[PDB]
Design an enzyme around this catalytic site. Structure first.
Site, short mmCIF file in Angstrom:
data_model
loop_
_atom_site.label_atom_id
_atom_site.label_comp_id
_atom_site.label_asym_id
_atom_site.label_seq_id
_atom_site.Cartn_x
_atom_site.Cartn_y
_atom_site.Cartn_z
N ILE A 100 -11.88 -0.99 -1.72
CA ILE A 100 -12.31 0.33 -2.15
C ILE A 100 -12.38 0.33 -3.67
CG2 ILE A 100 -10.01 1.45 -2.34
CD1 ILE A 100 -13.64 2.80 -1.55
N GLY A 101 -13.48 0.86 -4.19
CA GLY A 101 -13.77 0.81 -5.60
C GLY A 101 -12.94 1.81 -6.40
N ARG A 102 -11.65 1.53 -6.56
CA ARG A 102 -10.82 2.16 -7.61
C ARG A 102 -9.97 1.08 -8.29
NH1 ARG A 102 -10.98 6.25 -3.52
NH2 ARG A 102 -11.54 8.30 -4.38
N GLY A 103 -9.44 1.40 -9.46
CA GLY A 103 -8.65 0.43 -10.19
C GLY A 103 -8.18 1.00 -11.49
N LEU A 104 -7.83 0.11 -12.41
CA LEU A 104 -7.35 0.47 -13.71
C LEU A 104 -8.06 -0.40 -14.72
CD1 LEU A 104 -3.51 0.54 -13.35
CD2 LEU A 104 -5.01 2.58 -13.75
N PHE A 105 -8.61 0.23 -15.75
CA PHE A 105 -9.28 -0.50 -16.79
C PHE A 105 -8.81 -0.05 -18.15
CE2 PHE A 105 -12.63 -0.73 -19.92
CZ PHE A 105 -12.78 -2.09 -19.95
N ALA A 106 -8.30 -0.99 -18.93
CA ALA A 106 -7.78 -0.66 -20.25
C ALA A 106 -6.88 0.54 -20.06
CB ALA A 106 -8.94 -0.32 -21.21
N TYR A 156 0.86 -1.19 0.00
CA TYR A 156 0.00 0.00 0.00
C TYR A 156 0.88 1.21 0.00
CZ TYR A 156 -3.83 -3.11 1.40
OH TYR A 156 -4.76 -4.09 1.53
#
Lengths: 313, 313
Positions: free
Chosen positions: B203-209, B53
């Site tokens: 927690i709803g974050r991330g990486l998409f395409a 983290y």
């Protein structure tokens, strides 16, 4: 056969259609190579990779292996540096001159080539004036380690400032029928500086809240498209590619696929010809995003534990 | 005040509610510390972090800083190792004994403590029998570098096999009103082996395409919930937490927040008491996923170039 185009204004020539190697790593190597050979056999000579793709640059190593079976003097190799660390919801870029140099030299050895035709900054390091990064690239160019410089996902300010230090050959950025936010400012700027445009459509996988994710009235919009593709004697996939191809003689999309058949289908897109009026019809069939840049996506997540198993003793 | 609970069967005791430090890094340090102090002041003594983290373990360093202002003998520190590399759409786990040791020792110095109460395998290395990884952890335990071992996102087979080598104190895994796939097999297994359960809701974050993403009839379902929360004298957020809390005396959720007010609201959830019948009512208000594990999410992506700028000279 494959038409060829001047990308940027420094001397780079590429096939009108390039090939994105990313997906070849995700699977099996020898089949990866065959996809590449096959692409070259269809006239594609421009191949796109990055240090970041695959595992410890396995995507570059895979390409470098394809090239051993190919006339490399006839191929234009695009690779990239600058993504230093991918974290859970963000990406750390690095553009210090040391890193530029070491990434370059490292890609040269993974690819097993003596030079790279087109070497991009893959993500802009927001802590380092672009002039400094471009300075080292300028150097690489003069040493003959690379021939041409590209930017990826750069703001107009970065673009202008980079270009003043050494001419930028290409900008690789997301552009399709569904994502057109570069038309307002980016494109006219590339056209004003003589910078080629390399569109892509990223592949819909990622990580959301730590979980693997892939992408999944409205149908009335898919029928518009399919009906226009049918009208144009092509598939919806080809029609989208054709629309991109028709956005200028300086536009070189680089779709990737793991399948020979999808490859052939992409090449097929070149045979589709569209009038100014067929293109506006196609543009109009697809609504633009409400907010420029923002796009809404529905994705399916899967839990991590199902297959978190380990090899028995 | 805060009730305290035995987590697992080896001696670990924690506050009924733990605190997830992840979000404190994403921002400002001194405010991060204050969130931690404040949490401890509300009776939370169990703090969760990981080497992964923040940036180069800045989340552990932040916690280790909070602890300097706190009675560490009264605090239970949970940290983790094992995520080696995050890539675009996947995560590389590493569980060789060397890595286990070096990660441990590294977390000890970032946290600036002499031992870690609970140290987890954060992701299961699928190339390495779990017995081997657990063997090094067993060793850490005997050296007193760590007190208790945890698993995260492990299959039943991994769980059973780990436990046979050295007792597992806790399993941290995704469990909420909206994600209950562990109830079938995982939970009864933890209850059979005496393994504590540490639920989270990522927690709803991330990486998409390659793009930064965050998460965004149906409303009829939100009204069910809000109406039940109103009925229970709490907020929907608290009602979801309460449902989790009520799923057993061996369940210790570790919600995180960057805000003191959301912290207080989480602590508040402890005052909500629910009968067996109030809980089934709440369970029934929320449909289970069609396919176990799969979940569908709508996320907003933003383009990378907008702010890819660099500091002027």
């Amino acid at each position: 056969h494959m038409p060829r185009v001047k990308l940027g204004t420094q001397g780079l020539e590429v096939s009108k259609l390039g090939f994105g190697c990313m997906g070849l790593s995700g699977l099996p190597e020898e089949q990866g190579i065959a996809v590449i050979k096959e692409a070259f056999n269809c006239g594609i000579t421009f191949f796109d990779t990055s240090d970041i793709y695959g595992e410890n640059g396995s995507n570059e190593e895979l390409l470098g292996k394809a090239l051993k079976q190919l006339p490399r003097e006839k191929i234009q190799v695009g690779t990239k540096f600058g993504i230093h660390e991918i974290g859970f919801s963000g990406v750390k870029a690095k553009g210090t001159p040391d890193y530029v140099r070491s990434c370059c030299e490292a890609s040269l050895k993974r690819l097993d080539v003596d030079y790279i035709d087109l070497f991009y900054i893959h993500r802009i390091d927001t802590t380092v004036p672009i002039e400094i990064t471009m300075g080292e690239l300028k150097k690489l160019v003069e040493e003959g380690k690379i021939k041409y410089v590209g930017l990826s996902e750069a703001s107009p300010d970065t673009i202008r400032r980079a270009h003043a230090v050494h001419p930028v050959t290409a900008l690789q950025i997301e552009y399709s029928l569904w994502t057109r936010d570069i038309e307002d400012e980016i494109v006219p700027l590339c056209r004003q500086l003589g910078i080629g445009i390399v569109p892509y459509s990223p592949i819909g996988r990622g990580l959301f809240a730590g979980k693997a994710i892939k992408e999944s009235k409205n149908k009335q919009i898919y029928y518009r498209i399919e009906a226009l593709s049918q009208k144009h004697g092509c598939t919806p996939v080809q029609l989208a590619l054709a629309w991109v191809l028709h956005q200028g003689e300086d536009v070189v999309p680089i779709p990737g696929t793991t399948k020979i058949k999808n490859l052939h289908n992409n090449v097929g897109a070149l045979k589709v010809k569209l009038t100014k009026e067929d293109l506006k019809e196609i543009s109009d069939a697809v609504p633009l995003d409400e907010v420029a840049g923002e796009s809404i996506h529905e994705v399916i997540a899967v839990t991590n534990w199902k297959f978190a198993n380990t090899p028995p003793l």
